[PDB]
Amino acid sequence: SPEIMKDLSINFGKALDTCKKELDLPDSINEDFYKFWKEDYEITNRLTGCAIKCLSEKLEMVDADGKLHHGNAREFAMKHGADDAMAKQLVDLIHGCEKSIPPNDDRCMEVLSIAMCFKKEIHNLKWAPNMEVVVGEVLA
Ligand SMILES: CC/C=C\C=C/CCCCCCCCCC=O
């Protein structure tokens, strides 16, 4: 549902300022986060990809081979309201995106591609929250 996806979004973005400081990222990535869930908005900046990668790593969502860690993704989803079914459905969407995306040597671009594919799948399910919820109050 959009309500669960809002909560997952807020919690995924809570480390954004921490990741920006660790990576010395520029403020020109901020608008991409404010617009993350805006339908048809494409993020193209690889630096925003690096940030998304870091946010995933903060939640232990990347396994030792650079692919989704299903168990930790499931645990994250379920803490914030997903039942086992929704958790599985979310993980399957991300896995499906990993397998469909044009492959990329650059992890920041790979992550970006997976995020954009995932976003489109969530819109297709009518589960997208408001556009700006990943940021929450983290940049205020
Ligand atoms: C688990 C996500 C649920 C709600 C909102 C945002 C999640 C961020 C979507 C990006 C997915 C990152 C997967 C690629 C990680 C690099 O291997």
Residue numbers in the entry: 1 to 140
Question: Which lines from the publication concern this structure?
Answer:
A primary pheromone-binding protein (PBP) from A. transitella, (AtraPBP1) has been identified based on its expression profile in male antennae and its biochemical properties. Understanding the structural basis of pheromone detection and elucidating the mechanisms of action of olfactory proteins will aid in the development of novel and stable mimics of one or more of the attractants. These pathways are mediated in part by pheromone-binding proteins (PBPs), which are believe to be important in solubilizing the hydrophobic ligands and serve as an initial transporter that present odorants to a receptor in the membrane to elicit an olfactory response. To answer these questions and to pave the way for the design of a stable synthetic sex pheromone useful as a mating disruptor, we solved the high-resolution crystal structures at high pH of the liganded AtraPBP1 complexed separately with the major constituent of the sex pheromone of A. transitella, (11Z,13Z)-hexadecadienal (Z11Z13-16Ald) and the secondary constituent, (11Z,13Z)-hexadecadienol (Z11Z13-16OH). The pH 6.5 AtraPBP1 structure complexed with either Z11Z13-16OH or Z11Z13-16Ald adopts the same core canonical fold described previously for pheromone-binding proteins consisting of six α-helices connected by loops.
The binding site is highly complementary to these linear molecules in this particular conformation and is unlikely to be capable of binding molecules, which are longer or significantly diverge in shape. Both pheromones are firmly stabilized into the binding pocket primarily by an array of hydrophobic interactions. The hydrophobic interactions are mediated by the side-chains of Leu8, Ile52, Met61, Leu68, Ileu94, Val111 and Ile114 that make numerous interactions with the carbon chain. In addition, a stacked arrangement of a quartet of phenylalanines at positions 12, 36, 76 and 118 interact with the ligands near the desaturated carbons. In the case of the Z11Z13-16Ald pheromone constituent, the oxygen of the aldehyde group is hydrogen-bonded to the positively charged Arg107 guanidinium group. In addition, two water-mediated hydrogen bonds with the backbone oxygen of both Met61 and Gly66 complete the binding mesh of Z11Z13-16Ald in AtraPBP1. Accordingly, they are both almost completely sequestered from the solvent by the protein (2.7% and 2.2% solvent accessibility for the alcohol and aldehyde forms respectively). The average B-factor for both structures is relatively low with 18.2 Å2 (holo Z11Z13-16Ald) and 13.0 Å2 (holo Z11Z13-16OH) respectively. Possible x-ray radiation-induced damage was found in the Z11Z13-16Ald bound structure at the early stages of the refinement consisting of an unambiguous, discontinuous 2Fo-Fc electron density at 1.14 Å resolution located where the disulfide bond between Cys19 and Cys54 should be. The same bond was found intact on the refined structure from a preliminary dataset collected on a home source at 1.54 Å using the same crystal (data not shown).
